Design a protein around this ligand. Structure first.
Ligand SMILES: [Cl-]
Ligand SMILES: [Cl-]
Length: 123
């Protein structure tokens, strides 16, 4: 729960993300394909915002789907950067291309806490 929130922050929340800096952050945060081991995650999206800001999607700043009652779509647009694996199979060799877009974000909320990045939608 608190560990699920912290996992979500690690995987999906980085205010300093750019299209050209996927590789450093994916490596440093050790973001992987599976819950254990060393494998490069194929696709990973960072929301370009702070954690407390992203949390608000679960406490009034989002719309239940629903669809799936655990999923909330943000009312505001967020900038996201999607990092897609270009080469490498294991850290420290994971190389990504990054792509910025502006989207409403859809997060799974476990009560007041974001737990999963479901997707980002446009308009
Ligand atoms: Cl993702
Ligand atoms: Cl490798």
């Amino acid at each position: 729960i608190r560990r699920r929130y912290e996992h979500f922050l690690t995987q999906h929340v980085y205010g300093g993300i750019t299209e050209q800096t996927c590789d450093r952050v994916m490596r440093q945060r050790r973001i992987t394909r599976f819950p254990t081991g060393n494998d490069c995650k194929e696709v990973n999206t960072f929301i370009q915002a702070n954690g407390n800001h992203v949390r608000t999607v679960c406490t009034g700043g989002g719309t239940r789907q629903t669809d799936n009652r655990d999923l909330y779509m943000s009312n505001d647009q967020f900038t996201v950067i999607t990092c897609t694996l270009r080469s490498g199979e294991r850290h420290p060799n994971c190389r990504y291309r990054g792509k910025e877009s502006s989207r409403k974000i859809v997060v799974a909320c476990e009560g007041e806490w974001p737990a999963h990045y479901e997707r980002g939608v446009i308009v």
